[PDB]
mmCIF file of N, CA, C and O in Angstrom:
data_model
loop_
_atom_site.group_PDB
_atom_site.id
_atom_site.type_symbol
_atom_site.label_atom_id
_atom_site.label_comp_id
_atom_site.label_asym_id
_atom_site.label_seq_id
_atom_site.Cartn_x
_atom_site.Cartn_y
_atom_site.Cartn_z
ATOM 1 N N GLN A 1 195.558 61.652 116.629
ATOM 2 C CA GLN A 1 194.241 62.061 116.154
ATOM 3 C C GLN A 1 193.125 61.431 116.974
ATOM 4 O O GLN A 1 192.072 62.054 117.163
ATOM 5 N N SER A 2 193.353 60.227 117.500
ATOM 6 C CA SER A 2 192.375 59.597 118.383
ATOM 7 C C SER A 2 192.202 60.369 119.686
ATOM 8 O O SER A 2 191.070 60.585 120.141
ATOM 9 N N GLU A 3 193.312 60.803 120.296
ATOM 10 C CA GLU A 3 193.210 61.602 121.524
ATOM 11 C C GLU A 3 192.542 62.957 121.273
ATOM 12 O O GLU A 3 191.715 63.421 122.084
ATOM 13 N N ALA A 4 192.883 63.587 120.146
ATOM 14 C CA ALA A 4 192.269 64.857 119.777
ATOM 15 C C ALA A 4 190.765 64.714 119.564
ATOM 16 O O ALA A 4 189.997 65.600 119.952
ATOM 17 N N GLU A 5 190.318 63.592 118.993
ATOM 18 C CA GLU A 5 188.877 63.384 118.854
ATOM 19 C C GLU A 5 188.201 63.105 120.189
ATOM 20 O O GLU A 5 187.042 63.510 120.386
ATOM 21 N N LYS A 6 188.910 62.444 121.115
ATOM 22 C CA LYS A 6 188.373 62.224 122.459
ATOM 23 C C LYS A 6 188.076 63.533 123.181
ATOM 24 O O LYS A 6 187.092 63.620 123.919
ATOM 25 N N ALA A 7 188.908 64.556 122.982
ATOM 26 C CA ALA A 7 188.582 65.840 123.613
ATOM 27 C C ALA A 7 187.609 66.677 122.769
ATOM 28 O O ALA A 7 186.794 67.454 123.310
ATOM 29 N N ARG A 8 187.673 66.526 121.444
ATOM 30 C CA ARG A 8 186.815 67.274 120.535
ATOM 31 C C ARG A 8 185.344 66.919 120.711
ATOM 32 O O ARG A 8 184.483 67.769 120.454
ATOM 33 N N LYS A 9 185.051 65.697 121.169
ATOM 34 C CA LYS A 9 183.673 65.320 121.493
ATOM 35 C C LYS A 9 183.068 66.224 122.569
ATOM 36 O O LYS A 9 181.939 66.718 122.425
ATOM 37 N N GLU A 10 183.824 66.484 123.636
ATOM 38 C CA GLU A 10 183.331 67.335 124.714
ATOM 39 C C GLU A 10 183.232 68.794 124.282
ATOM 40 O O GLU A 10 182.293 69.502 124.690
ATOM 41 N N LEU A 11 184.186 69.247 123.457
ATOM 42 C CA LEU A 11 184.073 70.580 122.854
ATOM 43 C C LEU A 11 182.781 70.736 122.051
ATOM 44 O O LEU A 11 182.091 71.761 122.162
ATOM 45 N N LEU A 12 182.416 69.716 121.269
ATOM 46 C CA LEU A 12 181.192 69.792 120.476
ATOM 47 C C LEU A 12 179.940 69.738 121.342
ATOM 48 O O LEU A 12 178.929 70.362 120.992
ATOM 49 N N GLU A 13 179.993 69.033 122.476
ATOM 50 C CA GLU A 13 178.866 69.050 123.412
ATOM 51 C C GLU A 13 178.625 70.448 123.978
ATOM 52 O O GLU A 13 177.479 70.924 124.041
ATOM 53 N N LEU A 14 179.703 71.123 124.389
ATOM 54 C CA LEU A 14 179.548 72.466 124.942
ATOM 55 C C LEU A 14 179.084 73.463 123.884
ATOM 56 O O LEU A 14 178.281 74.360 124.179
ATOM 57 N N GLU A 15 179.562 73.312 122.647
ATOM 58 C CA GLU A 15 179.092 74.192 121.581
ATOM 59 C C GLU A 15 177.624 73.951 121.255
ATOM 60 O O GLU A 15 176.910 74.894 120.886
ATOM 61 N N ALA A 16 177.159 72.706 121.403
ATOM 62 C CA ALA A 16 175.740 72.413 121.223
ATOM 63 C C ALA A 16 174.890 73.109 122.279
ATOM 64 O O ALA A 16 173.837 73.682 121.957
ATOM 65 N N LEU A 17 175.344 73.084 123.538
ATOM 66 C CA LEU A 17 174.631 73.799 124.601
ATOM 67 C C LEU A 17 174.587 75.304 124.355
ATOM 68 O O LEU A 17 173.546 75.943 124.565
ATOM 69 N N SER A 18 175.702 75.885 123.895
ATOM 70 C CA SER A 18 175.738 77.328 123.650
ATOM 71 C C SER A 18 174.823 77.724 122.496
ATOM 72 O O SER A 18 174.146 78.760 122.559
ATOM 73 N N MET A 19 174.780 76.904 121.440
ATOM 74 C CA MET A 19 173.885 77.192 120.323
ATOM 75 C C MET A 19 172.427 77.083 120.746
ATOM 76 O O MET A 19 171.585 77.878 120.305
ATOM 77 N N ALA A 20 172.124 76.121 121.626
ATOM 78 C CA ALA A 20 170.770 75.983 122.164
ATOM 79 C C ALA A 20 170.349 77.226 122.932
ATOM 80 O O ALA A 20 169.249 77.757 122.716
ATOM 81 N N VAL A 21 171.240 77.717 123.803
ATOM 82 C CA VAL A 21 170.957 78.897 124.626
ATOM 83 C C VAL A 21 170.720 80.124 123.755
ATOM 84 O O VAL A 21 169.727 80.849 123.933
ATOM 85 N N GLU A 22 171.606 80.349 122.775
ATOM 86 C CA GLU A 22 171.496 81.522 121.904
ATOM 87 C C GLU A 22 170.213 81.500 121.076
ATOM 88 O O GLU A 22 169.504 82.520 120.993
ATOM 89 N N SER A 23 169.872 80.342 120.502
ATOM 90 C CA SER A 23 168.704 80.256 119.632
ATOM 91 C C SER A 23 167.406 80.436 120.409
ATOM 92 O O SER A 23 166.515 81.195 119.983
ATOM 93 N N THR A 24 167.282 79.766 121.566
ATOM 94 C CA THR A 24 166.039 79.911 122.311
ATOM 95 C C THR A 24 165.905 81.292 122.936
ATOM 96 O O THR A 24 164.778 81.795 123.024
ATOM 97 N N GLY A 25 167.018 81.959 123.271
ATOM 98 C CA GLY A 25 166.919 83.308 123.796
ATOM 99 C C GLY A 25 166.447 84.298 122.749
ATOM 100 O O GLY A 25 165.583 85.140 123.024
ATOM 101 N N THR A 26 166.986 84.188 121.524
ATOM 102 C CA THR A 26 166.572 85.081 120.443
ATOM 103 C C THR A 26 165.094 84.911 120.104
ATOM 104 O O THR A 26 164.347 85.906 120.012
ATOM 105 N N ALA A 27 164.646 83.654 119.961
ATOM 106 C CA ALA A 27 163.255 83.403 119.586
ATOM 107 C C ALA A 27 162.287 83.834 120.683
ATOM 108 O O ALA A 27 161.253 84.457 120.393
ATOM 109 N N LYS A 28 162.631 83.548 121.946
ATOM 110 C CA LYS A 28 161.797 83.943 123.076
ATOM 111 C C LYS A 28 161.670 85.456 123.186
ATOM 112 O O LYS A 28 160.570 85.974 123.426
ATOM 113 N N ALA A 29 162.779 86.182 122.989
ATOM 114 C CA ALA A 29 162.754 87.639 123.111
ATOM 115 C C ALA A 29 161.874 88.273 122.045
ATOM 116 O O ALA A 29 161.031 89.134 122.353
ATOM 117 N N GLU A 30 162.039 87.844 120.787
ATOM 118 C CA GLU A 30 161.244 88.425 119.706
ATOM 119 C C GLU A 30 159.758 88.108 119.866
ATOM 120 O O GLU A 30 158.900 88.992 119.690
ATOM 121 N N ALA A 31 159.441 86.870 120.264
ATOM 122 C CA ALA A 31 158.042 86.480 120.403
ATOM 123 C C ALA A 31 157.366 87.196 121.569
ATOM 124 O O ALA A 31 156.204 87.611 121.457
ATOM 125 N N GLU A 32 158.082 87.386 122.681
ATOM 126 C CA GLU A 32 157.477 88.071 123.815
ATOM 127 C C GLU A 32 157.304 89.563 123.562
ATOM 128 O O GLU A 32 156.329 90.152 124.049
ATOM 129 N N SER A 33 158.209 90.185 122.796
ATOM 130 C CA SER A 33 158.013 91.589 122.433
ATOM 131 C C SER A 33 156.779 91.763 121.556
ATOM 132 O O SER A 33 155.978 92.694 121.766
ATOM 133 N N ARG A 34 156.591 90.861 120.584
ATOM 134 C CA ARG A 34 155.398 90.929 119.745
ATOM 135 C C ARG A 34 154.118 90.681 120.542
ATOM 136 O O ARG A 34 153.108 91.362 120.311
ATOM 137 N N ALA A 35 154.157 89.769 121.518
ATOM 138 C CA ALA A 35 152.972 89.506 122.334
ATOM 139 C C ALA A 35 152.629 90.681 123.241
ATOM 140 O O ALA A 35 151.447 90.980 123.456
ATOM 141 N N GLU A 36 153.647 91.365 123.775
ATOM 142 C CA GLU A 36 153.397 92.528 124.623
ATOM 143 C C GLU A 36 152.782 93.678 123.832
ATOM 144 O O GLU A 36 151.817 94.309 124.297
ATOM 145 N N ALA A 37 153.331 93.955 122.638
ATOM 146 C CA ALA A 37 152.745 94.964 121.759
ATOM 147 C C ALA A 37 151.303 94.624 121.393
ATOM 148 O O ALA A 37 150.428 95.500 121.399
ATOM 149 N N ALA A 38 151.031 93.340 121.133
ATOM 150 C CA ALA A 38 149.677 92.918 120.793
ATOM 151 C C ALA A 38 148.707 93.063 121.961
ATOM 152 O O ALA A 38 147.548 93.441 121.750
ATOM 153 N N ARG A 39 149.161 92.795 123.189
ATOM 154 C CA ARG A 39 148.285 92.955 124.353
ATOM 155 C C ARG A 39 147.935 94.418 124.601
ATOM 156 O O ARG A 39 146.773 94.743 124.912
ATOM 157 N N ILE A 40 148.925 95.312 124.466
ATOM 158 C CA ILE A 40 148.659 96.742 124.635
ATOM 159 C C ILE A 40 147.694 97.240 123.564
ATOM 160 O O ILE A 40 146.749 97.990 123.859
ATOM 161 N N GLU A 41 147.879 96.783 122.318
ATOM 162 C CA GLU A 41 146.961 97.153 121.240
ATOM 163 C C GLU A 41 145.555 96.616 121.479
ATOM 164 O O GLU A 41 144.570 97.279 121.138
ATOM 165 N N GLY A 42 145.438 95.431 122.083
ATOM 166 C CA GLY A 42 144.120 94.872 122.340
ATOM 167 C C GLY A 42 143.345 95.638 123.397
ATOM 168 O O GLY A 42 142.148 95.916 123.228
ATOM 169 N N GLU A 43 144.014 96.001 124.495
ATOM 170 C CA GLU A 43 143.336 96.789 125.526
ATOM 171 C C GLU A 43 142.999 98.191 125.023
ATOM 172 O O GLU A 43 141.926 98.741 125.342
ATOM 173 N N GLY A 44 143.881 98.759 124.192
ATOM 174 C CA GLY A 44 143.563 100.019 123.548
ATOM 175 C C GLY A 44 142.374 99.917 122.617
ATOM 176 O O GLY A 44 141.562 100.840 122.539
ATOM 177 N N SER A 45 142.234 98.783 121.919
ATOM 178 C CA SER A 45 141.094 98.599 121.025
ATOM 179 C C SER A 45 139.792 98.472 121.802
ATOM 180 O O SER A 45 138.743 98.938 121.337
ATOM 181 N N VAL A 46 139.846 97.859 122.990
ATOM 182 C CA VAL A 46 138.672 97.804 123.868
ATOM 183 C C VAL A 46 138.235 99.211 124.276
ATOM 184 O O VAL A 46 137.042 99.562 124.210
ATOM 185 N N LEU A 47 139.202 100.044 124.676
ATOM 186 C CA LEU A 47 138.862 101.397 125.115
ATOM 187 C C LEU A 47 138.355 102.262 123.959
ATOM 188 O O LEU A 47 137.399 103.037 124.126
ATOM 189 N N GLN A 48 138.972 102.116 122.777
ATOM 190 C CA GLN A 48 138.484 102.778 121.566
ATOM 191 C C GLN A 48 137.056 102.373 121.237
ATOM 192 O O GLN A 48 136.247 103.217 120.828
ATOM 193 N N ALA A 49 136.738 101.083 121.396
ATOM 194 C CA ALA A 49 135.398 100.595 121.090
ATOM 195 C C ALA A 49 134.360 101.194 122.027
ATOM 196 O O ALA A 49 133.274 101.596 121.581
ATOM 197 N N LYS A 50 134.698 101.312 123.314
ATOM 198 C CA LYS A 50 133.762 101.906 124.271
ATOM 199 C C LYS A 50 133.522 103.390 123.990
ATOM 200 O O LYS A 50 132.374 103.864 124.029
ATOM 201 N N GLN B 1 189.969 75.497 124.040
ATOM 202 C CA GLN B 1 188.684 75.826 123.431
ATOM 203 C C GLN B 1 187.518 75.321 124.269
ATOM 204 O O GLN B 1 186.458 75.963 124.299
ATOM 205 N N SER B 2 187.707 74.210 124.981
ATOM 206 C CA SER B 2 186.675 73.716 125.888
ATOM 207 C C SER B 2 186.430 74.673 127.049
ATOM 208 O O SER B 2 185.273 74.952 127.398
ATOM 209 N N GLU B 3 187.504 75.196 127.652
ATOM 210 C CA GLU B 3 187.334 76.169 128.739
ATOM 211 C C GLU B 3 186.689 77.469 128.249
ATOM 212 O O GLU B 3 185.817 78.048 128.932
ATOM 213 N N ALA B 4 187.101 77.926 127.063
ATOM 214 C CA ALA B 4 186.516 79.125 126.473
ATOM 215 C C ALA B 4 185.027 78.947 126.195
ATOM 216 O O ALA B 4 184.242 79.880 126.400
ATOM 217 N N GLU B 5 184.608 77.751 125.772
ATOM 218 C CA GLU B 5 183.177 77.520 125.580
ATOM 219 C C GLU B 5 182.422 77.440 126.899
ATOM 220 O O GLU B 5 181.254 77.868 126.964
ATOM 221 N N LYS B 6 183.071 76.927 127.954
ATOM 222 C CA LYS B 6 182.453 76.908 129.282
ATOM 223 C C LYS B 6 182.122 78.310 129.782
ATOM 224 O O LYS B 6 181.094 78.504 130.438
ATOM 225 N N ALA B 7 182.970 79.295 129.483
ATOM 226 C CA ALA B 7 182.614 80.657 129.895
ATOM 227 C C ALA B 7 181.698 81.356 128.878
ATOM 228 O O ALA B 7 180.855 82.203 129.248
ATOM 229 N N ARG B 8 181.839 81.009 127.596
ATOM 230 C CA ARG B 8 181.041 81.610 126.537
ATOM 231 C C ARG B 8 179.561 81.281 126.676
ATOM 232 O O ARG B 8 178.720 82.082 126.244
ATOM 233 N N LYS B 9 179.234 80.140 127.293
ATOM 234 C CA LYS B 9 177.836 79.812 127.586
ATOM 235 C C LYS B 9 177.174 80.864 128.479
ATOM 236 O O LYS B 9 176.057 81.329 128.195
ATOM 237 N N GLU B 10 177.867 81.282 129.538
ATOM 238 C CA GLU B 10 177.315 82.283 130.446
ATOM 239 C C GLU B 10 177.251 83.661 129.796
ATOM 240 O O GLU B 10 176.292 84.420 130.037
ATOM 241 N N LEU B 11 178.254 83.989 128.971
ATOM 242 C CA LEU B 11 178.185 85.217 128.171
ATOM 243 C C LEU B 11 176.944 85.247 127.277
ATOM 244 O O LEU B 11 176.254 86.276 127.193
ATOM 245 N N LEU B 12 176.621 84.121 126.635
ATOM 246 C CA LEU B 12 175.446 84.074 125.769
ATOM 247 C C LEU B 12 174.145 84.146 126.557
ATOM 248 O O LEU B 12 173.159 84.709 126.058
ATOM 249 N N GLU B 13 174.126 83.618 127.785
ATOM 250 C CA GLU B 13 172.946 83.771 128.639
ATOM 251 C C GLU B 13 172.680 85.237 128.975
ATOM 252 O O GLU B 13 171.533 85.714 128.897
ATOM 253 N N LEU B 14 173.734 85.969 129.345
ATOM 254 C CA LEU B 14 173.555 87.379 129.681
ATOM 255 C C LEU B 14 173.161 88.205 128.460
ATOM 256 O O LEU B 14 172.346 89.135 128.570
ATOM 257 N N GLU B 15 173.710 87.874 127.290
ATOM 258 C CA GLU B 15 173.309 88.584 126.079
ATOM 259 C C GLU B 15 171.862 88.292 125.705
ATOM 260 O O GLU B 15 171.176 89.167 125.159
ATOM 261 N N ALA B 16 171.382 87.081 126.009
ATOM 262 C CA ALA B 16 169.975 86.760 125.791
ATOM 263 C C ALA B 16 169.067 87.603 126.679
ATOM 264 O O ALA B 16 168.038 88.119 126.213
ATOM 265 N N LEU B 17 169.445 87.767 127.953
ATOM 266 C CA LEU B 17 168.675 88.631 128.853
ATOM 267 C C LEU B 17 168.654 90.082 128.383
ATOM 268 O O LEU B 17 167.605 90.743 128.433
ATOM 269 N N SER B 18 169.798 90.592 127.909
ATOM 270 C CA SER B 18 169.856 91.982 127.454
ATOM 271 C C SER B 18 169.014 92.199 126.201
ATOM 272 O O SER B 18 168.340 93.231 126.069
ATOM 273 N N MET B 19 169.029 91.231 125.279
ATOM 274 C CA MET B 19 168.203 91.346 124.080
ATOM 275 C C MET B 19 166.722 91.297 124.427
ATOM 276 O O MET B 19 165.912 92.015 123.823
ATOM 277 N N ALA B 20 166.362 90.475 125.421
ATOM 278 C CA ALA B 20 164.978 90.415 125.892
ATOM 279 C C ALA B 20 164.519 91.757 126.440
ATOM 280 O O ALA B 20 163.436 92.247 126.082
ATOM 281 N N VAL B 21 165.359 92.376 127.280
ATOM 282 C CA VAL B 21 165.035 93.664 127.899
ATOM 283 C C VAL B 21 164.857 94.748 126.843
ATOM 284 O O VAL B 21 163.859 95.488 126.851
ATOM 285 N N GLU B 22 165.800 94.826 125.894
ATOM 286 C CA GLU B 22 165.749 95.856 124.854
ATOM 287 C C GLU B 22 164.518 95.707 123.963
ATOM 288 O O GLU B 22 163.821 96.701 123.687
ATOM 289 N N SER B 23 164.204 94.475 123.549
ATOM 290 C CA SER B 23 163.090 94.257 122.633
ATOM 291 C C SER B 23 161.749 94.547 123.295
ATOM 292 O O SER B 23 160.890 95.231 122.709
ATOM 293 N N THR B 24 161.553 94.056 124.530
ATOM 294 C CA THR B 24 160.269 94.306 125.170
ATOM 295 C C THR B 24 160.106 95.765 125.574
ATOM 296 O O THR B 24 158.978 96.272 125.518
ATOM 297 N N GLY B 25 161.200 96.478 125.870
ATOM 298 C CA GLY B 25 161.079 97.890 126.182
ATOM 299 C C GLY B 25 160.675 98.711 124.973
ATOM 300 O O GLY B 25 159.801 99.582 125.068
ATOM 301 N N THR B 26 161.286 98.421 123.813
ATOM 302 C CA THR B 26 160.942 99.142 122.587
ATOM 303 C C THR B 26 159.485 98.919 122.190
ATOM 304 O O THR B 26 158.751 99.886 121.907
ATOM 305 N N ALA B 27 159.039 97.653 122.209
ATOM 306 C CA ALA B 27 157.671 97.345 121.794
ATOM 307 C C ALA B 27 156.643 97.932 122.755
ATOM 308 O O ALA B 27 155.631 98.500 122.314
ATOM 309 N N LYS B 28 156.909 97.838 124.065
ATOM 310 C CA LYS B 28 156.012 98.394 125.072
ATOM 311 C C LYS B 28 155.887 99.907 124.947
ATOM 312 O O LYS B 28 154.778 100.451 125.041
ATOM 313 N N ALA B 29 157.011 100.599 124.710
ATOM 314 C CA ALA B 29 156.986 102.057 124.612
ATOM 315 C C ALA B 29 156.175 102.523 123.413
ATOM 316 O O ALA B 29 155.320 103.417 123.539
ATOM 317 N N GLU B 30 156.412 101.911 122.245
ATOM 318 C CA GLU B 30 155.685 102.322 121.045
ATOM 319 C C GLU B 30 154.191 102.028 121.162
ATOM 320 O O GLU B 30 153.350 102.873 120.805
ATOM 321 N N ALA B 31 153.844 100.863 121.720
ATOM 322 C CA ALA B 31 152.437 100.493 121.832
ATOM 323 C C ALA B 31 151.697 101.373 122.835
ATOM 324 O O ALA B 31 150.546 101.763 122.593
ATOM 325 N N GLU B 32 152.347 101.728 123.947
ATOM 326 C CA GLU B 32 151.679 102.573 124.929
ATOM 327 C C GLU B 32 151.530 104.011 124.447
ATOM 328 O O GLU B 32 150.532 104.662 124.781
ATOM 329 N N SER B 33 152.483 104.514 123.652
ATOM 330 C CA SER B 33 152.316 105.848 123.073
ATOM 331 C C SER B 33 151.137 105.885 122.107
ATOM 332 O O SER B 33 150.332 106.834 122.128
ATOM 333 N N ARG B 34 151.003 104.847 121.272
ATOM 334 C CA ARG B 34 149.862 104.786 120.361
ATOM 335 C C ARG B 34 148.536 104.655 121.109
ATOM 336 O O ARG B 34 147.546 105.291 120.719
ATOM 337 N N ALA B 35 148.511 103.900 122.211
ATOM 338 C CA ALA B 35 147.278 103.757 122.984
ATOM 339 C C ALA B 35 146.889 105.053 123.685
ATOM 340 O O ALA B 35 145.699 105.376 123.782
ATOM 341 N N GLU B 36 147.877 105.813 124.170
ATOM 342 C CA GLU B 36 147.584 107.088 124.819
ATOM 343 C C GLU B 36 147.023 108.105 123.831
ATOM 344 O O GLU B 36 146.037 108.795 124.138
ATOM 345 N N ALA B 37 147.644 108.203 122.644
ATOM 346 C CA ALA B 37 147.117 109.068 121.591
ATOM 347 C C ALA B 37 145.698 108.672 121.194
ATOM 348 O O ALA B 37 144.830 109.537 121.018
ATOM 349 N N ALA B 38 145.434 107.363 121.112
ATOM 350 C CA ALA B 38 144.101 106.891 120.760
ATOM 351 C C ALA B 38 143.063 107.206 121.833
ATOM 352 O O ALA B 38 141.922 107.543 121.499
ATOM 353 N N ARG B 39 143.442 107.125 123.112
ATOM 354 C CA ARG B 39 142.499 107.454 124.185
ATOM 355 C C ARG B 39 142.144 108.936 124.191
ATOM 356 O O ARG B 39 140.968 109.300 124.380
ATOM 357 N N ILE B 40 143.145 109.803 123.984
ATOM 358 C CA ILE B 40 142.877 111.242 123.922
ATOM 359 C C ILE B 40 141.981 111.572 122.732
ATOM 360 O O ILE B 40 141.025 112.353 122.855
ATOM 361 N N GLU B 41 142.237 110.935 121.581
ATOM 362 C CA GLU B 41 141.387 111.138 120.408
ATOM 363 C C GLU B 41 139.966 110.637 120.640
ATOM 364 O O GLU B 41 139.008 111.239 120.146
ATOM 365 N N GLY B 42 139.807 109.555 121.405
ATOM 366 C CA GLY B 42 138.472 109.036 121.664
ATOM 367 C C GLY B 42 137.640 109.949 122.547
ATOM 368 O O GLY B 42 136.459 110.195 122.267
ATOM 369 N N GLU B 43 138.246 110.473 123.617
ATOM 370 C CA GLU B 43 137.512 111.405 124.476
ATOM 371 C C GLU B 43 137.213 112.715 123.751
ATOM 372 O O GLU B 43 136.128 113.303 123.921
ATOM 373 N N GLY B 44 138.146 113.156 122.899
ATOM 374 C CA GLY B 44 137.874 114.305 122.056
ATOM 375 C C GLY B 44 136.741 114.062 121.082
ATOM 376 O O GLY B 44 135.943 114.958 120.819
ATOM 377 N N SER B 45 136.637 112.835 120.554
ATOM 378 C CA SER B 45 135.551 112.516 119.630
ATOM 379 C C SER B 45 134.205 112.502 120.338
ATOM 380 O O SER B 45 133.189 112.890 119.748
ATOM 381 N N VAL B 46 134.185 112.074 121.606
ATOM 382 C CA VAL B 46 132.960 112.147 122.411
ATOM 383 C C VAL B 46 132.508 113.598 122.578
ATOM 384 O O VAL B 46 131.324 113.930 122.390
ATOM 385 N N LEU B 47 133.454 114.484 122.906
ATOM 386 C CA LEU B 47 133.096 115.886 123.118
ATOM 387 C C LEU B 47 132.664 116.568 121.818
ATOM 388 O O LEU B 47 131.706 117.354 121.810
ATOM 389 N N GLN B 48 133.349 116.249 120.709
ATOM 390 C CA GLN B 48 132.938 116.722 119.386
ATOM 391 C C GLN B 48 131.530 116.268 119.037
ATOM 392 O O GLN B 48 130.752 117.037 118.460
ATOM 393 N N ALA B 49 131.195 115.014 119.367
ATOM 394 C CA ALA B 49 129.873 114.482 119.058
ATOM 395 C C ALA B 49 128.784 115.211 119.831
ATOM 396 O O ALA B 49 127.730 115.537 119.268
ATOM 397 N N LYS B 50 129.046 115.520 121.105
ATOM 398 C CA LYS B 50 128.058 116.247 121.905
ATOM 399 C C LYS B 50 127.844 117.673 121.393
ATOM 400 O O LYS B 50 126.700 118.143 121.292
#
């Protein structure tokens, strides 16, 4: 069980990196899509106002 | 399981890129269609006013 925990530590490190990658990719994608839609709506609102 | 996580990290990176592409394409398309309809309505409103 000691040897198994010695390797399980490195397994948990790699799983931590993968969870980091997945979470930041999901949040970045959703936030940038909302910002792009908002920018297009803002320039459209400028043209509507004129 | 350690080797499988070493490759699964790169799989999750590529899936993050694909989700980014899909989300920003959908939001950009819907926002630009609404802006185009609004611009045509605005120029029509100018001509109606005259």
